[PDB]
Amino acid sequence: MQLTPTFYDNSCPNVSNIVRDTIVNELRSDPRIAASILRLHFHDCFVNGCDASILLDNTTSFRTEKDAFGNANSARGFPVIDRMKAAVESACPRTVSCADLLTIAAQQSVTLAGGPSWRVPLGRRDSLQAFLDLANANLPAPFFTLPQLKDSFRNVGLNRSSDLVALSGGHTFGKNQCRFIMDRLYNFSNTGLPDPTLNTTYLQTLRGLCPLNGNLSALVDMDLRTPTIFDNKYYVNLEEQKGLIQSDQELFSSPNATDTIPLVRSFANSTQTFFNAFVEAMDRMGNITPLTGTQGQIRLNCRVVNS
Ligand code: HEM
Numbered sequence: 110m111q112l113t114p115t116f117y118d119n120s121c122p123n124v125s126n127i128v129r130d131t132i133v134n135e136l137r138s139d140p141r142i143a144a145s146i147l148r149l150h151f152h153d154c155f156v157n158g159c160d161a162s163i164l165l166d167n168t169t170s171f172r173t174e175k176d177a178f179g180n181a182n183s184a185r186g187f188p189v190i191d192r193m194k195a196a197v198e199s200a201c202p203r204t205v206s207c208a209d210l211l212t213i214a215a216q217q218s219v220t221l222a223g224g225p226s227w228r229v230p231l232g233r234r235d236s237l238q239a240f241l242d243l244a245n246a247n248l249p250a251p252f253f254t255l256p257q258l259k260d261s262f263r264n265v266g267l268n269r270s271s272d273l274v275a276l277s278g279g280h281t282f283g284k285n286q287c288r289f290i291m292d293r294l295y296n297f298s299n300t301g302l303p304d305p306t307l308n309t310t311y312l313q314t315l316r317g318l319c320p321l322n323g324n325l326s327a328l329v330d331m332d333l334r335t336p337t338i339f340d341n342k343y344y345v346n347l348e349e350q351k352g353l354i355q356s357d358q359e360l361f362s363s364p365n366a367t368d369t370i371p372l373v374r375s376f377a378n379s380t381q382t383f384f385n386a387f388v389e390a391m392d393r394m395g396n397i398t399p400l401t402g403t404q405g406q407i408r409l410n411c412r413v414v415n416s
Pocket residue numbers: 141143144145146147148151182183184185249250251252253258276277278279280282283284285286289331354356
């Protein structure tokens with residue numbers, strides 16, 4: 110029972126519309142929600158697949174993935190997911206899984222930010238548990254080298270460098286905390302110097318936003334060109350050594366980037382090339398070990414398993 114974009118065309122043909130309206134509304138008060146939602150889907154899929162396991166709250170039986178190093182004080186937008194979930198439950202009771210809801214929400218967030226528009230495959234079901242340890246082991250970190258980034262993607266089933274380069278384009282919008290670049294700014298890999306792959310002019314700007322012994326929670330735009338617009342500007346930045354986190358710049362500057370450099374350039378040269386690759390990579394990531402058929406359930410409240 111493979112995933113299909115028409116899964117809810119009869120049971121809830123208005124699901125995508127409900128999701129979109131919820132995001133449109135939220136964007137007025139929080140213009141960062143779109144980026145935040147896309148990241149939630151990414152963090153869901155990289156841990157036991159896209160099964161909404163990340164949406165589960167703490168229980169006496171299992172710890173929440175929300176306390177993972179990659180999610181704690183970082184992941185956000187959970188209340189917004191509850192809102193669209195409630196709205197969908199009203200329109201179509203016990204029909205749309207949280208896993209599918211989050212996938213649609215990620216796609217709509219990308220489109221609303223100016224990105225490509227497409228119908229994501231559907232039919233995923235919700236996990237019966239959360240996987241904190243697995244999240245700590247599977248979620249990639251900003252300090253990862255290119256070989257480590259590739260290993261992290263391959264680990265969850267994405268072997269193509271195209272998947273890695275295209276999906277990294279998610280950093281074409283959204284925010285990043287000073288904490289994750291302090292090493293690149295003042296002491297990279299215990300060298301006592303800033304990361305040489307970071308543009309010196311941009312280095313000065315970032316140091317001003319993130320001074321030593323400063324607020325590590327302060328936010329910086331992932332894309333200095335178009336902070337809230339989903340476009341290929343992220344790759345243009347890499348070509349100028351303006352990737353924000355180490356994992357971004359590595360795609361273009363790593364000694365192991367022989368295969369990723371041409372992809373970065375290709376995406377920087379054509380928005381069409383990037384958008385096509387992003388959709389293709391997004392659908393592949395959304396196809397990671399999904400629960401289908403009668404496996405798992407259709408969670409009524411994304412924060413807890415049905416009882
Ligand atoms: C290649 C490995 C990746 C690493 C190491 C990574 C790392 C990070 C880090 C450190 C942040 C900042 C979190 C914070 O400041 O609290 C972030 C933000 C973000 N990431 Fe990535 N990321 C990766 C891949 C992806 C992918 C595959 C997507 C989705 C297609 C994605 C989408 C986002 C978005 C949209 C934001 C902004 C979230 C917000 O503003 O709330 N990332 N990422």
